[PDB]
Design a protein around this ligand. Structure first.
Ligand SMILES: [Zn+2]
Ligand SMILES: [Zn+2]
Lengths: 307, 307
């Protein structure tokens, strides 16, 4: 049984990307009216992380706020040509960190949307963290029969620079499909239910509930796949209609992945089954990612209890 | 029978809004590879109307290119204060107009995408235009039983400043739903099919096909409906899930239209059945349009032929 410290300070971040409206709308509402996110014994602080991008309804001002929380950026002196989001990341770190300190917030839920058909998605940064595996098992049980899928990042590069990484326990909450700059009522309902259960879990944990051992399936990112490109670097083929909206569904080497305007089909390739995620995300065209290949695995957590 | 001269000069505009990728991708392709839009006897010119917005994948740089083709803007003196899209509209007017001259292009197809669930949509500016009614009837007939809906936008305050308004016969071609900044294969195949039949119609008309009288159903704009807003001017309620994606379907006075986070449902109101269009289009939040109410009517066209 993993013995563990009670959680005291929780933040809920929305508008990390300024055009992802669900987190913006909920955090804006909870700042006005906090009853929904109140839990006995918890300090819960909703916060808009990129208000300048939110006011422009744009992903970012100068660079992605979700890529500048690495140590180098958090400790960088200001310079004239430095992206705005580096200065904003320091401001957020000053309020909710410092990152890697005992004073840092215990849990940060960073709220995101995607244009990909990923449904309710939890992002896990540590495959050995019993506390988070337990929380995610709890949320999934409460959301059932809506799928609630878990994306695991092991590589340090794709997690160490994220906004949620300031917390002792980072949690990414990702819900799609939703076009950026749109608020869909269904997506809002799904995200608010995920949060309701995550907060319930934390309060129960604090109150001394002992959670028995559990296991969850997770999809661990293997590598990004770019679009085929023309000499000039523009996209030469698009996501095949059979792959479009089929995030999480197994893809085999001969299955079609891209299609060109002439009707040429390009299949997955390789030697293994993969589970594609972020299929056709708008923000990722410039990041050279048509989708990411993942592998499925099981994580077990030991029982846990507050000390 | 209305006899008209053969159509000679046709333009196909893509990227009027730079983040609506279907027309950008198709036009970019046809500039290099024109066979798909070749027709015997026709001069077909693909053209990217807002190259700066396209390169930044954004709707516009300074102002909406689809709002600046009014004579005041087009006749504005060249200066350094001038919005980029004003300077660009004047270039387009010189190349494909001038608007209101006998030298203007005969047909301009302006290609758009929407995040609303509208399917294939043709935009008609003039309810008396026998040639356009016949073209649209042809396209609908050829696509049957696939959805192909016609939106009639007639008042001068609504039509006078559009990019396509330079042509003798302006045609808007609109296909959704597609997140902006995303290219879906399905949406691409729908828009290519509309255009194939539109160009086939023009060729047959020029070749002497005589078209008997026809009729089409259209949805004529009545008025825009904004989101309920707080004192601050931020959105206070979102599109109700029963209205979400239900473009074109009759909506009655007591049917739900918005829902707040606190759960208040706001009904249509008024005294008549309407047909909503552009339900939840991302670009329209700032235009104060949650959706447009329309009324359905039948338009007849005389027999037409080429002289
Ligand atoms: Zn995001
Ligand atoms: Zn448009």
């Amino acid at each position: 049984c993993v013995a563990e410290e009670p959680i005291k300070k929780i933040a809920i971040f929305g508008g990390t990307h300024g055009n992802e409206l669900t987190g913006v709308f909920l955090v804006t509402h909870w700042l006005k009216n906090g009853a929904e996110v109140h839990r006995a014994g918890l300090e819960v602080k909703p916060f808009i992380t990129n208000p300048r991008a939110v006011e422009k309804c744009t992903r970012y001002i100068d660079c992605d706020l979700n890529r500048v929380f690495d140590l180098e950026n958090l400790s960088k002196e200001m310079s004239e040509d430095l992206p705005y989001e580096v200065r904003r990341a320091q401001e957020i770190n000053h309020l909710f960190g410092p990152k890697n300190s005992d004073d840092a917030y215990d849990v940060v839920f960073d709220l995101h949307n995607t244009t990909s058909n990923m449904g309710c998605t939890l992002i896990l940064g540590d495959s050995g963290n019993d506390f988070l595996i337990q929380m995610f098992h709890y949320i999934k049980t409460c959301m059932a029969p809506l799928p609630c899928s878990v994306y695991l990042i092991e590589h340090p590069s794709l997690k160490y620079a994220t906004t949620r990484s300031i917390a002792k326990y980072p949690v990414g909450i990702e819900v799609g499909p939703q076009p950026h700059g749109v608020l869909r009522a269904d997506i809002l309902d799904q995200m608010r239910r995920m949060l309701k259960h995550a907060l319930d879990f934390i309060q129960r944990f604090n109150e001394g509930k002992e959670f028995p051992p559990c296991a969850i399936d997770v999809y661990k990112i293997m590598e990004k796949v770019d679009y085929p490109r023309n000499e000039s670097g523009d996209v030469a083929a698009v996501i095949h209609p059979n792959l479009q909206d089929q995030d999480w569904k197994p893809l085999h080497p001969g299955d079609p992945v891209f299609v060109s305007l002439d009707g040429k089909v390009i299949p997955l390739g390789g030697d293994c089954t993969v589970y594609p995620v972020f299929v056709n995300e708008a923000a990722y065209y410039e990041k050279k990612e048509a989708f990411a290949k993942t592998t499925k695995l099981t994580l077990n957590a030991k029982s846990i209890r507050s000390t």
